[PDB]
Write a protein that binds this ligand. Structure first.
Ligand SMILES: NC(=O)C1=CN([C@@H]2O[C@H](COP(=O)(O)OP(=O)(O)OC[C@H]3O[C@@H](n4cnc5c(N)ncnc54)[C@H](OP(=O)(O)O)[C@@H]3O)[C@@H](O)[C@H]2O)C=CC1
Ligand SMILES: NC(=O)C1=CN([C@@H]2O[C@H](COP(=O)(O)OP(=O)(O)OC[C@H]3O[C@@H](n4cnc5c(N)ncnc54)[C@H](OP(=O)(O)O)[C@@H]3O)[C@@H](O)[C@H]2O)C=CC1
Ligand SMILES: CCCC[C@H](CC(=O)O)C(=O)C(=O)O
Ligand SMILES: CCCC[C@H](CC(=O)O)C(=O)C(=O)O
Ligand SMILES: [Ca+2]
Ligand SMILES: [Ca+2]
Lengths: 414, 407
């Protein structure tokens, strides 16, 4: 029979990533794994039909079943509202999910030996732990229409006092203003997730803030990270001959730029978004990256495809024209999610399947079979001929062909 | 007879970059240029002694004389306060001077033909325009001691809209919160500075925000840039076959990493700080970069060393002085442009050529030697110490100026 997968929360996406999402299930997953799939359509039209409530419901389902796999989704702008006749410009589904689940988003490049790096020195991988809560991505911003006073206040729950901070006094014209926050318990979980990842990988840990300018806001990050390290992880880091050190964000980017990789980089929410694409593009391809949210409870995770929905290929697919879409990021979202499922269920067979699918993906590309984007990384786009790459279905066919071989060879071992 | 330099405002710095600052004046500037130098000791000890008033006075002198050159300074924190026994944890001198002067900080790599780039495709130079006003670098942040409400409010001086927004309701434990702002007029001057720089260099311009998430805050940047572009600059951009487009910040870093350079990168205040080190390190060395604040009045300029006061610190040292030198040359070059001073303009350009020619001839400091061969495979024979490299530059500056005098 097939492998007893377990309960997995699925989040369907938009445009070309939704087409690839179904190809992965039909060709690579379902033929070998039986899943209790709790499907939530996070497509832009079902989010619009439910007033974005399906997004919140999918997050609660991940809390209940501990495993979620997410397809890439559209964050609508002004043009998207016109295109789909949306009722509202719905907020980012990833922001809503991360705000509900909390935790740390760990991102790392998907390395193939034949994909050229842009940073030649990065001979070892760089893992970024993105704090998935607060800051710019859960803030209150507004337009200041004219002269006036913008203030930010804090009132303790006991109501015994009240502190009013002056943000700015607009004396001529208007502008913008915003307020953002972060939570002590969220920063402490963010620290523990960062220290444990450095111990499981054997690499040093670096936290990047700007506490020289944000003395109180970022100073909380530096103090919490430093307090937890000295009390619970100091001797453990010294045992594995590693370390933890705080860095200014501007110095950290340049430090990582000229390093040789091999370290954990704990980033605040906004820096994690910016610099993970900096790392992904530096290793070769922006789309060759994993993105797994690790919740503070230590049992719930959300694996996702972090790139876009590839609109240009979706337009070609609807006109029946040939496309060449890279599915690796969407594939590794399934494997990373199924791997954690097998860890929680002690499923030896599901764990072997997830790792085997990741091997087949890497081995197929390293054998010379790849989509057009990966061929352009090697030969350069103006030098890419049609015989240099495979289309969307040819590449999925090659993966399923090689996955079927590797899984069959493993059966002949009893 | 030396060159009549004119009135220049000087800002002295901290630690090693202060030592280099005096060596540049002693060995490169003073022997050839006579200056009405307005000196302001922005050292951490004198800032503490004057309760940071010397920083505000220096910023105001820049308004009056239109040209200032700044040495790298210490921004104190907890470890620095205990070190110098400071009264307060003084704010950044650059944050104060920029908040007073306003304008755009343009940063660009100092290119030497024999320095290897970490990003191979970058064959054309990238120029970052940093909005020097507002955002996290002029914000109000604080620690939330416990449960309670954090609200942000806008009270109009003449209007009917006393609006209150809930920032967050802390229900368990405490945390942190902050409020920040920006100004329409400052964003507009930031827009014009970006469009005009792209037309003077003949390159396309890109603006990076995160307006998909910060719809109102960052949407204002994108709307103001697009409105000024369509009304006052789109025809000129099409004439030179260049363009302006808005990008998301995370998409923009990956696009720039994958590009071949040759564009202007309009950056918000925080991104301008982070990404300018990303660009400088990608072109080779973090300390080979110019940083000039251009004020919106089109005549006031502040040149600085973009890096720090030598983080990594009677022995010999070998420390790169190029960025500090170009702070002087860019300042004197603008001092000469304002004064129509041809001799001063020639001296400023000659010193920059001497600096690049010396490095391209094999004479360089230890960091640049480690750039070409790697630090572990670097010996004393591969570099010059601090005093020898400065003497080598002065030896070549005396030669270049003597050659031009006999022509
Ligand atoms: N985290 C998330 O869920 C994110 C979602 N998005 C959403 O994605 C949508 C489109 O974003 P956009 O900026 O246009 O980026 P796209 O994903 O559309 O990518 C732009 C171009 O890159 C190439 N490309 C990207 N991904 C692949 C792939 N897997 N295989 C092959 N080629 C690829 C294609 O180039 P070519 O045409 O030359 O073949 C494509 O036209 C938006 O609605 C946005 O909100 C965006 C970013 C993150
Ligand atoms: N005045 C200003 O504008 C600035 C002031 N500062 C202040 O400086 C201090 C430290 O700053 P910080 O951001 O930590 O670090 P720095 O900006 O001083 O530089 C960090 C690293 O970059 C490399 N580097 C920088 N400048 C040079 C150079 N000229 N030649 C060769 N290599 C160079 C060195 O790398 P490696 O270790 O590999 O040799 C150095 O360790 C603080 O007090 C801070 O407030 C910081 C930034 C700007
Ligand atoms: C929640 C804000 C950050 C998420 C954003 C995609 C999105 O618009 O949801 C992004 O660039 C990323 O996935 O890193
Ligand atoms: C508020 C401006 C902060 C600038 C900072 C240096 C500092 O003052 O600490 C920095 O590294 C730079 O951008 O040059
Ligand atoms: Ca991103
Ligand atoms: Ca900096």
């Amino acid at each position: 029979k097939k492998i007893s997968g377990g309960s997995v929360v699925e989040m369907q996406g938009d445009e070309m990533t939704r087409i690839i999402w179904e190809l992965i299930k039909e060709k690579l997953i379902f033929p070998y794994v039986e899943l209790d799939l709790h499907s939530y359509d996070l497509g832009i039209e079902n989010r619009d039909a439910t007033n974005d409530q399906v997004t919140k419901d999918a997050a609660e389902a991940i809390k209940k079943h501990n495993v979620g796999v997410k397809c890439a989704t559209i964050t609508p702008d002004e043009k998207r509202v016109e295109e789909f006749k949306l009722k509202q410009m719905w907020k980012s589904p990833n922001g809503t999910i991360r705000n509900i689940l909390g935790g740390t988003v760990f991102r790392e490049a998907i390395i193939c030996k034949n994909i050229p790096r842009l940073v030649s020195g990065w001979v070892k991988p760089i893992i970024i732990g993105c704090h998935a809560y607060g800051d710019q991505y859960r803030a209150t911003d507004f337009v200041v229409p004219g002269p006036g006073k913008v203030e930010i206040t804090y009132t303790p729950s006991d109501g015994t006092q009240k502190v009013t901070y002056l943000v700015h006094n607009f004396e001529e014209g208007g502008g913008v203003a915003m307020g953002m926050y972060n939570q002590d318990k969220s920063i402490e979980d963010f620290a523990h997730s960062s220290f444990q990842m450095a111990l499981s990988k054997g690499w040093p840990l670096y936290l990047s803030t700007k506490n020289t300018i944000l003395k109180k806001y970022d100073g909380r990050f530096k103090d919490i990270f430093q307090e937890i390290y000295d009390k619970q992880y100091k001797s453990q880091f010294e045992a594995q001959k590693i370390w933890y050190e705080h860095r200014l964000i501007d110095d950290m980017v340049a430090q990582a730029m000229k390093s040789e990789g091999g370290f954990i980089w704990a980033c605040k929410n906004y820096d994690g978004d910016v610099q993970s694409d900096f790392v992904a593009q530096g290793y070769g391809s922006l789309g060759m990256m994993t993105s797994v949210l690790v919740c503070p409870d230590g049992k719930t995770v959300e694996a996702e495809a972090a790139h876009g929905t590839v609109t240009r290929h979706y337009r070609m697919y609807q006109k029946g024209q040939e496309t060449s879409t890279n599915p690796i990021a969407s594939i590794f979202a399934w494997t990373r999610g199924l791997a954690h499922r097998a860890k929680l269920d002690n499923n030896k067979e599901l764990a072997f399947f997830a790792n085997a699918l990741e091997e087949v993906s890497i081995e197929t590309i390293e054998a010379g079979f790849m989509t057009k984007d990966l061929a352009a990384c090697i030969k350069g786009l103006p030098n890419v001929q049609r015989s240099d790459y495979l289309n969307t279905f040819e590449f999925m066919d090659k993966l399923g062909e090689n996955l079927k071989i590797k899984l069959a060879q493993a059966k002949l071992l009893e």
